Design a protein around this ligand. Structure first.
Ligand SMILES: *[C@@H]1O[C@H](CO)[C@@H](O[C@@H]2O[C@H](CO)[C@@H](O)[C@H](O)[C@H]2NC(C)=O)[C@H](O)[C@H]1NC(C)=O
Ligand SMILES: *[C@@H]1O[C@H](CO)[C@@H](O[C@@H]2O[C@H](CO)[C@@H](O)[C@H](O)[C@H]2NC(C)=O)[C@H](O)[C@H]1NC(C)=O
Ligand SMILES: *[C@@H]1O[C@H](CO)[C@@H](O[C@@H]2O[C@H](CO)[C@@H](O)[C@H](O)[C@H]2NC(C)=O)[C@H](O)[C@H]1NC(C)=O
Ligand SMILES: *[C@@H]1O[C@H](CO)[C@@H](O[C@@H]2O[C@H](CO)[C@@H](O)[C@H](O)[C@H]2NC(C)=O)[C@H](O)[C@H]1NC(C)=O
Ligand SMILES: *[C@@H]1O[C@H](CO)[C@@H](O)[C@H](O)[C@H]1NC(C)=O
Ligand SMILES: *[C@@H]1O[C@H](CO)[C@@H](O)[C@H](O)[C@H]1NC(C)=O
Ligand SMILES: [Ca+2]
Ligand SMILES: [Ca+2]
Ligand SMILES: [Ca+2]
Ligand SMILES: [Ca+2]
Ligand SMILES: [Cu+2]
Ligand SMILES: [Cu+2]
Lengths: 712, 712
């Protein structure tokens, strides 16, 4: 509440303040993001710029002054001879006085082409594509029944892929032309266009290449002449619902006419929410939605003792192959698209339980004013349907000495990212026994292309005209564990057999397990590449010992199917060198807070952060502020079941943090939810309890869904 | 209901019938299992002996005669010159006429020593240990305050480990001496005794070796003389609750005085249960608790079409190291202990939801009569707290074209096994979109030994006098997939990069994913050892194609941390050669229905099934009845949090079966649970539905727990 305020995202008022401040500086010549020109200076992003960890810890632990509060302000400088992007620490909040230019990068010339694509830019792009396809109007109507001009009922739409070209400083986008219908992602026409939209005058932008149904055509006029002259082999496209729709069809042979079970919370939340500060049994932690990178949890304690200064989403990637130029061009990095800013409204009873506590926020990303995002996050406790622990202590003669068990519950902090086609559900999950989990579930629409037969060596035919392209999902977390404090060491444990004389039968031998430990002293020792077999136990230790002599530690357990995807060193792989390492441990530093950025998507050849560089000074990691970095992911080969959407079952990855000799015993023993039943020969067994059995009823508030996200 | 009866376990009546039948054969000279002698012929196990798959399929698919119903009857022949164990197909049911001797094994002499340990045998063992420790009475009272004689308030108890000796035909058990208190598993005295209980006359059994607090003593009298003469360095042992108890202690700094959310099912079960036959949306399947091996599902269909003839638990293993003779002796294989027969009563609201449908059964395992097991299984639908699918189709200008989502639900078929210290929760889980999952969660008490400092190279100090021994949990499943029918092939898919000229920029290159496939023609090709990297996509295919040209298939996705544990070929590893293979594919055969047995625990050197042998004829697996075999597991290094119990969070393994081009589109589209919200400028959005929004209340039946398991 009062403490966690340091970790809190910017209020509507705070965002408006920083905006007025920057607008008051007339020399910036700022214009709203909506202006219909690239030739413009604009404030593209504003978010809370976290203070130094040193000062934050002195405020939290040493009772010191509250650290100064600061905005990050990403300004696009389109309106000048040499356009660029610059970032700025605007502070203090409240009462802004300065804007301090952030992280200079000498040598680099391509900041302008590395920019994310804005709303305005898309608008202008829609203008280009309308002009340049003028010659193909007839072609469109004959092949698709749709068009870019007038169009009314049947409009052709497009999906830009990224990155945009073949080298740094390029902004040449492959656009996949589709029919704008329900779930338009699944309706490619077969046309693809390369548009150079590099210039700040949209008048110089041009369609530099055409691809149709397996063939390149140079220009639209050329495809038009060649079609008109019978030289283009074309494909003419087509109650019941669209295959691309979520509307039901088919019948289960055992049909279902009622709602399934739901959660009731008659006694209210058992966690205490206050601002961005949560308490839940042993747990205490803060959170934030960083507009740029996504969801975080900060200052995580269990039982008064710190475990993690920060756990946060760093980058989310989708790397594709293809038969078509667009399909082979696609390496999507979502932080270039505002992964934290596409946190669209959760639907009660669907996305989160009806009983969940829904939380709003504001994002200033490619916006004229701060934008209200309703139910951007939810927080809720749910039954797991599996008991946290249980034991049937039998007496092996017909009866029992006792049954004990603690019904399973968990607190879930959830948000989403829906950039375009895909919907990622982000989870941070807190068990009563000190285990924390991180999960990502993928759902929504797959990224897909027009079917030709050559495209089956890069994916799967999902429908008559639809190829689901092969791709890898990879996600990077930053896991700043501060186990029982700032200073830690990292160690790993393996089982190693020993071959020894049988001590009670000297003729024979005993080959058996033995607990082997490995210390790690330098960063590079703890950079585990995908070929390097990952040790079964990954422990981040405190020097303090538990009551039984063992180092107090937290274990990191990764759930993933990731492998190496791009060849190390090759081109666009420079943007995702974190993807070489399922685990990497660095020594903490203010210069290495993020493994990605908003610029990586459009200049992955020469990005402003290469995670590999973090390891270059190969620093000593004995008793230092350590940071774990985790890559989780999976190879997604589309299948017919992904139509209309990828389903979440089994489509999740993440990791667990588990206490390991951190607590003297099971820290969930504090829970009064436990139930022990004791045997009696005569009458009812003694159902021993510490909370009364409850069977109360309550009723959730009625369903509602706004679906809009505007300023306030 | 009428069909699934072929897969159904034996009724109380059926078990009684087979028993009377075998009792009527006077030449067997049978005695009840309770008789206080090993020198006895007894019926140790009776269970339903599944008919041949050929006949079962002709009954299910070809509309043929119902296959004859048969009991398996494991008889111990203790009362003869050469004791042995023999098994028998007793049938037909109803109206038994014969008992046909099962699976002869020429050459083998050690069937008697391979027997599971019975109640009676434990009784006799308690007699031996009381006699033989007579000299140590004083020692016990001085060190432990407890004893084996009179004892009343303070009785010493024991925990036998397995296997029992150093070669086949031995029955020499290391016993860990403990104080019989609440959670006695965690109270080792420091004494260990090797008892040869090989003879059928308990009068010949003898304590052949003693181990105390780091030293072997030959005999009890010798430890007694040496203690009495000041030569034995000993350790004297010790409101608040026992550390080994489930009773709460400690306080959360944010305390919790109310129950957390619970499931209500006001509209009843949405699945139809009839006998051992279940329907749930697309799903149809049967089940059984095989007393010997555990839970199975049989005849699994989705949408009328078969996917799996059988999915079943085959074996569950716990392989330990130790400082002490017992700790280094312990390789527990639970099927030797009646893994399916220790299915003790589920506690409503704890083990399964209050809203679950609880099912009883009967087991005849080491019993004088069939024994009623209340709530041995449960079946229930629960919300996952994650939507099966969802999408926010934005219009990227402040609003939305629609939100769609299907709230997440799942059907869980659950049982447990609690052999002794450990409690395994077995799950079979059915999602509405055709995904099925198999899960095992471990909880209950760890297997532990007396603390000496040498024991820290085989585990962890959990308490003053308690070492939690290092071990590996490994589980074997039999996964008889019959994907769209009996005949299948197995293939795997990988991503393989290609390096090609950039087709739209010939100066540059494109290094990108490409979908590679691998066919498998022989068994040995599909035996993946732990060093052999497992392909990301493991597909069992039908020849039939979907509407888009792709082979209809089900994908197997393993969730595990298993590695090779014992060296292939070395001794007791002969019992667990399935543990070499995270996946193995065999061609179906009536001689290879199980990868383990009830004999493996006590003769793992020369067991009656070696899974490796299944692969020896290396048969062709192109379009044949294939059987998948899966090993899942994890290295368990005990930690202080495992006290008093191992907690289930993150302590689970298993696998998913997912449709892969099996269905023309998402098979969950049949579900009327889906909700689509449509945008409107004026008033409320159109919340489009196919089941009415529901907010009904109901109340679960009040908590109860019997805790006994007797005949009826
Ligand atoms: C990025 O563009 C900004 C805006 O023009 C440049 O910053 C200005 O630089 C000139 C010096 O040539 C100063 O007179 C202004 O005071 C600066 N203003 C601000 C707000 O920064 C900046 O130099 C450009 N970056 C690069 C690398 O050239
Ligand atoms: C464990 O160690 C022993 C001793 O090195 C090995 O036993 C020897 O094995 C060879 C055959 O490989 C025999 O010729 C020797 O006679 C054996 N000696 C003894 C004393 O047993 C054994 O192979 C090793 N086992 C493992 C799994 O490493
Ligand atoms: C296991 O013990 C059984 C019981 O004695 C043996 O089965 C009997 O064998 C004799 C032949 O020596 C027959 O006369 C009996 O009719 C058999 N009875 C039954 C019920 O099987 C069996 O031979 C023993 N197994 C082995 C391998 O020796
Ligand atoms: C992809 O293939 C090309 C051609 O084999 C490789 O490019 C050559 O790389 C070497 C250096 O390793 C240069 O000397 C040649 O001039 C390059 N030729 C061309 C046409 O580019 C490239 O290294 C390969 N990349 C990968 C990741 O395998
Ligand atoms: C959504 O919220 C906006 C902003 O408060 C409000 O004006 C509008 O009426 C709401 N729309 C719906 C459909 O509830
Ligand atoms: C448990 O069930 C048995 C068998 O029906 C019954 O006799 C007994 O009264 C029940 N015990 C309890 C405590 O409910
Ligand atoms: Ca740290
Ligand atoms: Ca470094
Ligand atoms: Ca099969
Ligand atoms: Ca074979
Ligand atoms: Cu995907
Ligand atoms: Cu374990």
């Amino acid at each position: 509440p009062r403490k966690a305020g340091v970790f809190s995202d910017l209020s509507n008022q705070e965002l408006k303040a920083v905006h007025s401040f920057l607008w008051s500086k007339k020399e910036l010549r700022l214009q709203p993001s909506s202006t219909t020109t690239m030739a413009k200076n604009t404030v593209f992003l504003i978010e809370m710029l976290l203070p130094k960890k040193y000062h934050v810890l002195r405020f939290l632990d040493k009772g010191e002054r509250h650290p100064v509060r600061e905005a990050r302000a990403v300004i696009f400088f389109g309106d000048q001879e040499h356009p660029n992007v610059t970032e700025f620490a605007v502070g203090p909040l409240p009462g802004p006085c300065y804007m301090r230019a952030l992280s200079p990068r000498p040598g680099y010339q391509s900041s302008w082409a590395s920019r994310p694509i804005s709303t305005a830019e898309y608008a202008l792009l829609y203008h280009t594509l309308q002009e340049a396809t003028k010659p193909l109007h007839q072609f469109f109507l004959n092949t698709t029944g749709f068009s870019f001009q007038d169009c009314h009922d049947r409009c052709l739409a497009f999906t830009d892929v990224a990155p945009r070209g073949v080298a740094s400083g390029q902004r040449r986008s492959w656009l996949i032309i589709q029919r704008y219908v329900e779930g338009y992602f699944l309706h490619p026409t077969g046309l693809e266009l390369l548009v150079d939209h590099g210039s700040t005058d949209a008048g110089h932008w041009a369609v530099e290449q055409v691809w149709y149904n397996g063939k390149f055509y140079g220009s639209p006029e050329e495809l038009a002449r060649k079609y008109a002259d019978g030289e283009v082999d074309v494909v003419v496209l087509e109650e019941p619902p669209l295959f691309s729709s979520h509307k039901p069809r088919g019948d289960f042979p055992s049909p279902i006419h009622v709602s399934g079970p739901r959660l009731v919370q008659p006694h209210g939340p058992r966690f205490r929410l206050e601002g961005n500060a949560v308490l839940y049994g042993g747990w205490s932690f803060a959170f934030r939605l960083r507009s740029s990178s996504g969801l975080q949890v900060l200052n995580v304690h269990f039982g008064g003792e710190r475990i993690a200064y920060e756990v946060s989403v760093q980058e989310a990637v989708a790397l594709y192959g293809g038969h078509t130029p667009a399909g082979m061009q696609t390496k999507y990095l979502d932080v270039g698209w505002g992964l934290g800013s596409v946190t669209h409204e959760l639907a009660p009873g669907i996305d989160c339980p009806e009983t969940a506590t829904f939380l709003d926020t504001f994002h200033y990303y490619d916006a004229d004013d701060p934008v209200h995002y309703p139910r951007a996050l939810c927080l809720f406790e749910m039954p797991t349907g599996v008991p946290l622990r249980r034991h049937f202590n039998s007496n092996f003669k017909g009866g029992f000495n006792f049954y004990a068990g603690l019904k399973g519950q968990v607190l879930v902090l959830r948000t989403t990212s829906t950039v375009y086609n895909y919907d990622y559900i982000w989870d941070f999950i807190f068990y009563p026994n000190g285990v924390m989990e991180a999960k990502m579930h993928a759902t929504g629409y797959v990224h897909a292309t027009f079917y030709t037969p050559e495209g089956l060596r890069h994916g799967t035919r999902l429908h008559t005209h639809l190829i689901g392209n092969i791709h890898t999902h990879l996600v990077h977390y930053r896991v700043d564990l501060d186990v029982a404090g700032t200073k830690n060491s990292f160690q790993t444990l393996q089982m190693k057999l020993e071959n020894i004389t049988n001590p009670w039968s000297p003729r024979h031998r005993v080959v058996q397990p033995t607990l082997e430990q490995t210390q790690y002293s330098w960063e590079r020792q703890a950079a585990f590449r995908f070929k390097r077999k990952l040790p079964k136990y990954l422990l981040f230790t405190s020097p303090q010992e538990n009551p039984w002599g063992h180092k107090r530690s937290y274990r990191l357990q990764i759930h993933s199917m990731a492998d190496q995807v791009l060849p190390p060193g090759w081109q666009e792989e420079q943007a995702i060198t974190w993807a070489r390492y399922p685990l990497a441990v660095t020594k903490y530093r203010e210069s290495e807070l993020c493994s990605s950025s908003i610029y990586h998507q459009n200049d992955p050849w020469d990005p402003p952060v290469v995670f590999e560089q973090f390891l270059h000074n190969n620093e000593n990691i004995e008793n230092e502020d350590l940071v774990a970095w985790v890559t989780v992911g999976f190879l997604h080969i589309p299948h017919s079941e992904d139509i209309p959407n990828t389903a979440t079952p089994g489509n999740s990855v993440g990791f667990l943090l588990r206490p390991f000799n951190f607590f003297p015993e099971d820290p969930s023993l504090a829970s009064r939810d436990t139930v022990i039943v004791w045997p009696r020969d005569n009458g009812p067994n003694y159902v021993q309890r510490w909370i009364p059995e409850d069977r109360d009823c309550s009723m959730p508030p009625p369903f509602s869904y706004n679906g809009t996200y505007r300023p306030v």
